[PDB]
Design a protein around this ligand. Structure first.
Ligand SMILES: O=C(Nc1nnn[nH]1)[C@@H]1CN(S(=O)(=O)c2cccc(C(F)(F)F)c2)Cc2ccccc21
Ligand SMILES: O=C(Nc1nnn[nH]1)[C@@H]1CN(S(=O)(=O)c2cccc(C(F)(F)F)c2)Cc2ccccc21
Ligand SMILES: O=C(Nc1nnn[nH]1)[C@@H]1CN(S(=O)(=O)c2cccc(C(F)(F)F)c2)Cc2ccccc21
Lengths: 257, 256, 257
């Protein structure tokens, strides 16, 4: 059948139609797996965890584990994963902490590559790519279409804006605004993901307004308040520029410069 | 307690309270002490001693041979203390004869996902190795040391008591006790003042250490000039002696 | 017997007579293992894949999985491993893509340490060392005797020259010429692997010629074509200098400086 007899399914666990579990996989108590989701061999799922439809989870992944501690501490804490996600070999995903959200949240159509770490209370949106060995410390918010290149380290509470790009080996300590490309340890803003805008079919008017929006924030010596005021008009014409202005507005503890 | 789908070698030695998850291998000459929980999918190889009330998580390879070419199959050891947590996919290699033929881990150590503890490494107590920390080999980590995620330590380096390394740090030279280091290559920034307050250090002892840092790092002295300047502060404050002693035992230089 | 009864051997799998396979290992369809090869417990082998003779593959390794790269669409691509290779704990090796030569290729006597990654369409030669957590993004050519120390990151299409050395935590966006020593993120050219050359028994005359060849490429203000021209004489005299000159000539992303 679809359920390999060498897998251990806890009596409390809930499996929907067309679910596959490979051999020697543990689907622990309070884990719920959605329609057509494929669990490979040698996977550990721990709950309380909700996984949606048409997901693929590869061998050696630990999905819904507790955040590391010298002692067991703080539950019920949730992990929620949406639909059409690919979680590759040996990925670690921790559930939330009772102190903060009490939930780690992953949306839809995300690709999390081998040995990536998703820390407690982190929130991933849709259509994101975390390349090999990307580590989100915890309480990290990754917005839609963001790409973290291989071995990107993100500090606790940092926001990764929509359509942003972090070069491989980047260590991020401050918010990355929407569309911004960052590199190095510590991470420095370089340009914008113009490549990614074109692959999203952004009007060349929107891309040119986003180029000027970069220069307003990074290049003209403005305060953030002065920048937000200078962007207000562009943000009103282009929803794309508003995503950018909003990412800067939301950064209380400062942006990656 | 011992899951029937685990392979326990005849010559393994497990206390009554020990839990072994399914699909785990307790290899030849593996001692495991009372209260220790071995998760599923764990490979333990010997000769290895594991103390008490330890927790080893799935996909961990504890007590394998180093691939370091200078190792040639000698019966070298791995000792682990008590109340240690070893997380998902941690690799801990046994020692080599060229040193002391032992990798040593003490008590109350938190070793997070995919950390590497190379051959002959000595970790003390209440240490934190965050995800993907790599100790290349012969690395001595002293009590209360914290190495942040993806911290790389070159062979033979000493990580001082209460020292802290920023994430993605690459350490080539000894880190003195209490010192904070960041970047590739690693550079001294300040003292672990949080760590001192964690331990309940006197505001005297913290002020003495704040000064001691300036003597070594900020006053354009040499190491020899600096050691002599500290010797009185060191004699008065056992806390300052830990710092001064870590600089003296640094024969291959300190992280500046 | 040598195949553990808890192992899963696909009917279509071809194992030489003395092949060992540890418990809860998977030898999938169209996987060939040559004589002497030992597979440890908890190993996943997917095909189409050819593993040669006297190889050792450690636990938690995923050898021959599909690349998550979005351009691969389930085409029947290959992985080929030669003889006398050691693959340590948790290594990932993906098969090729039809956009290149539909093959990922490893030669002989290579040491690939724990959690190292070998991306689609990568070509490793002989006597290479990939230290812990080294990652080749894809289409990476590593020539014979190349050392990549721990957590070395290699961008797609980068060529790592013969007897080259990359320091711990290096991030390589451009070709590493043969013999050259690189460090840092981004990677920086800092002289040549003279201790490597003296160890493998290179002549004093050859080492002295490589020393001058280095000055011509890096220290004489020459553009690459001006340099390739000046090396032409010395490359005709010494094979080592030809390998060096050849590595520079075949740089598609430029060279590490
Ligand atoms: O194209 C890109 N270039 C880039 N990275 N950093 N700076 N520039 C990124 C990175 N990659 S990748 O190189 O193929 C890759 C895959 C596995 C492992 C790694 C490694 F670990 F970094 F080595 C890299 C995947 C990817 C997928 C969609 C969009 C952009 C990218
Ligand atoms: O604060 C700290 N390191 C720091 N700060 N600035 N530079 N490096 C360390 C690190 N953390 S962490 O960020 O929550 C964490 C957890 C898992 C993975 C990672 C990652 F892999 F680095 F991304 C980070 C866990 C932790 C727990 C008690 C004491 C100190 C620490
Ligand atoms: O000797 C060397 N020195 C050097 N590397 N980078 N800069 N200097 C390299 C690196 N080493 S290693 O330190 O013993 C080692 C082993 C496992 C893990 C690591 C770590 F992950 F980086 F921490 C390091 C293993 C090794 C083996 C053959 C040839 C050269 C090397």
């Amino acid at each position: 059948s679809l359920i390999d007899p060498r897998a251990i399914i806890d009596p409390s666990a809930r499996l929907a139609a067309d679910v596959q579990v490979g051999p020697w996989s543990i689907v622990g108590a309070e884990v719920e797996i959605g329609e057509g989701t494929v669990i490979g061999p040698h996977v550990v799922l721990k709950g309380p965890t909700k996984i949606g439809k048409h997901n693929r989870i590869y061998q050696f992944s630990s999905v819904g584990e507790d955040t590391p501690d010298l002692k067991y501490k703080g539950e019920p804490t949730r992990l929620v994963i949406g639909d059409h996600n690919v979680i590759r070999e040996g990925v670690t995903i921790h559930r939330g902490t009772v102190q903060d959200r009490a939930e780690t949240t992953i949306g839809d159509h995300n690709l999390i590559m081998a040995y990536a770490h998703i820390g407690h209370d982190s929130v991933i949106g849709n259509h994101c790519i975390l390349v090999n060995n990307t580590a989100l410390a915890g309480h990290v918010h990754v917005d839609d279409w963001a790409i973290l290149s291989g071995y990107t380290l993100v500090h606790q509470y940092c926001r990764i804006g929509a359509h942003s790009f972090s070069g491989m080996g980047s260590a991020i300590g401050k918010d990355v605004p929407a569309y911004v490309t960052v590199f190095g340890n510590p991470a420095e803003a370089r340009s914008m993901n113009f490549e990614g805008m074109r692959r999203r079919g952004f009007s060349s008017e929107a891309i040119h307004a986003l180029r000027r929006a970069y220069k307003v924030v990074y290049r003209q010596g403005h305060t953030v308040e002065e920048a937000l005021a200078e962007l207000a008009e562009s943000a009103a014409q282009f929803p794309e520029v508003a995503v950018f202005r909003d990412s800067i507005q939301s950064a209380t503890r400062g942006i990656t410069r």
